[PDB]
């Protein structure tokens with residue numbers, strides 16, 4: 001009601017106009033879920049109906065959060081975000097806590113609700129304009145505007161920075177070790193606590209939060225046994241580039257030696273030091289693929305030799321904070337998926353494989369979709385920024401089902417490839 | 428009258444200013460009509476002459492046309508239109524007939540000169556100033572500004588769409604089951620009310636608008652039952668396009684062809700079968716639209732063919748949210764596919780067709796999928812649902828396609844069904860080197876400048892071979908070298924190439940390309956028992972490379 005806050009004056013980065021991203025047609029199911037959600041928002045004054053004097057837009061999708069509960073709207077604030085928040089990060093720039101990744105566990109609390117209090121500058125409300133679609137363009141679309149701090153916008157947590165701190169002060173002083181990072185509206189909180197301790201320390205923070213500001217979190221784990229998630233209780237004390245083993249073929253075969261020589265050849269791009277010359281020799285005949293040729297004493301020396309140069313990594317570790325990180329996925333098998341995060345090719349800051357073998361949920365789109373997110377958290381936790389994705393899926397196909405299996409608050413940037421993977425193997 | 432509607436605030440572009448576009452002193456003659464038309468217009472309350480404190484000015488134009496018995500005014504605020512803001516994009520999307528539902532009765536009501544009955548923001552009025560002067564020498568510069576929405580300014584339609592939308596609100600609040608769409612300056616009201624019982628409401632509506640000054644000139648809702656909108660032709664229970672004629676004659680020019688293809692596509696929405704391959708392929712040249720496009724027999728063959736279908740009229744039914752949408756697809760021929768979405772047993776709702784223009788050489792299964800998609804998308808956009816598919820391909824063929832793809836896909840519920848062209852993997856390579864079969868070290872290259880090449884090879888049994896080649900680049904010879912190894916091979920064969928390309932293509936498990944070499948490479952594989960292509964980086968110094976490479980010195984050396 002009637003008693004509010006002051007307005008931190010936001011403004012679009014000079015030489016930029018407001019966004020006009022077009023609204024992705026949505027299934028009816030979601031259209032309805034959106035008119036519901038949206039209307040209470042009109043009734044609680046959070047968002048207000050608008051006229052044609054305003055021509056902007058920034059997409060919305062409905063999504064069902066926390067293991068299939070009821071719908072939550074999501075505004076794809078990427079473009080706007082980009083436009084205002086980029087230069088706004090130079091100002092109200094929140095900082096990134098290195099130590100974080102080092103903490104045994106990082107749990108994640110959605111502090112989204114909060115932002116729904118500080119009001120928004122009358123003039124900036126102009127851009128928060130989202131348009132909810134009507135099947136088959138039968139209706140003109142229920143156009144809204146935003147009065148409070150929209151959730152997706154990145155200007156919002158910078159604004160709600162002030163309030164959010166003090167809410168935490170007394171907690172931080174009693175819990176100094178507990179590191180608390182804030183990204184978009186998500187509370188990444190980590191410790192080196194024995195799991196149970198960390199569990200508690202968190203809900204302690206859950207409760208505290210509620211006292212101090214009716215800032216409400218989700219009751220992730222009650223006394224009941226459930227097959228539901230174990231909480232995003234991350235553990236960045238487990239991460240590495242261990243599985244890229246050159247085959248251990250005792251029965252080396254002409255084929256083999258080729259395959260091996262092959263692997264070592266592009267590999268030589270991420271490890272300019274290795275040499276396969278000495279191996280391309282034991283293969284110089286024009287024999288049947290299936291025949292053994294391990295001989296060259298001088299060679300068993302190079303197999304072994306290069307074999308371990310893998311473990312011991314390269315210079316590719318210059319986290320340039322100016323260049324933006326690129327995430328990249330490769331479909332690998334019946335559950336295997338892999339990524340690589342890098343700024344300049346072969347100068348990959350980190351890489352990893354995702355695993356969840358098609359069983360009780362075989363949708364590739366799903367497995368991919370998930371991974372894109374499990375890929376993200378990391379990047380956030382570590383660099384404190386979303387990597388641009390290189391999705392190996394059809395545009396049109398993804399543009400349709402990401403919004404389904406999706407259970408996250410932010411939306412990374414992405415692009416789809418249509419270029420076969422030489423990079424396909426076991427790694 | 429005018430409408431008592433809440434005006435909508437408009438403002439010129441940031442850092443802009445009202446136009447000063449002065450005008451060319453039109454003939455004293457129609458200079459009179461500008462007046463007599465303007466006086467009444469001013470007297471209707473649409474204009475209010477003010478010439479002092481308003482330096483802005485636009486050009487008045489005037490003339491008569493389109494079976495009329497009177498003068499008409501012309502004025503284009505184009506400069507003003509340039510200095511104005513961008514409003515909401517009224518309708519960045521028309522509805523698709525296949526999505527509407529059946530109603531008992533409908534009616535369209537022309538919304539008079541709608542734009543006038545509405546009032547422009549009390550301030551912008553200034554920026555809509557015009558000057559009508561009196562004779563070649565004396566004109567006190569009589570100036571008038573607008574009050575209602577200018578006839579050809581940028582805001583009008585958006586504002587207007589909105590205003591009316593407001594005006595209809597309470598009525599449709601009191602009358603909820605009478606569907607209304609608007610749009611241009613046309614109001615389409617429809618429902619499930621008996622003809623008379625329907626004209627009942629239309630009157631309640633018709634006066635409601637009369638309340639807000641929106642004189643609807645429709646007497647008893649006078650409207651043609653066959654509505655002519657966006658090419659479609661609609662009725663309360665059915666819809667379809669109707670004036671489509673393939674002009675037959677000699678002197679077939681580019682434009683005529685382009686036109687011809689558009690024409691067909693459109694028909695295709697409802698007309699089950701239309702092909703457009705050959706005719707579509709021909710226009711593949713650049714803008715010489717004026718010249719002649721010699722349609723071969725292959726094209727002429729399809730034209731006259733669609734001409735046959737396009738001759739006998741087809742009709743589509745409407746959506747019934749009470750029933751499951753269904754989509755059945757068939758590979759009509761080559762890269763051309765077709766599909767239909769029905770609700771019940773045999774009344775077509777919507778028809779379409781996917782075409783493999785995409786990349787270059789594509790698998791068919793892949794193709795099915797790429798089509799299952801376009802369909803999926805289209806449905807969302809219309810019925811808000813996803814149709815269950817009727818797909819011509821067994822479950823085991825597909826289930827082995829996607830599991831192998833490097834890309835991801837999603838298979839909505841579809842049931843397999845039997846019909847002609849059947850979707851299945853023609854050939855299929857092996858997974859590890861076949862023991863026994865003759866490892867064949869394929870190779871060859873060509874000299875681009877001299878365009879001469881040589882494909883050839885060296886099995887593992889002392890067996891070599893080669894062929895001189897004219898007009899072939901390294902990529903062609905490469906596959907061609909695979910071609911050889913496939914002729915000279917036997918049932919089970921192990922090939923090995925230097926090529927990344929050929930390695931690629933052969934692996935795409937393609938078919939029916941526009942590349943005979945390929946078509947043939949495919950054909951062998953098809954006719955084969957156990958292939959196993961392989962890849963060793965060319966020039967890497969593998970003897971298998973070194974050698975088949977050394978054969979090349981027979982062409983020249985470097």
Ligand SMILES: CC(C)=CCN1Cc2c(Cl)ccc3[nH]c(=S)n(c23)C[C@@H]1C
Pocket residue numbers: 522524527528529530533606607608610615616617654656661662663664
């Ligand atoms: C596509 C256009 C102009 C639609 C307007 N339109 C009228 C119409 C017609 Cl013409 C045929 C079947 C119809 N089914 C539905 S719903 N409508 C309908 C209502 C809307 C109001």
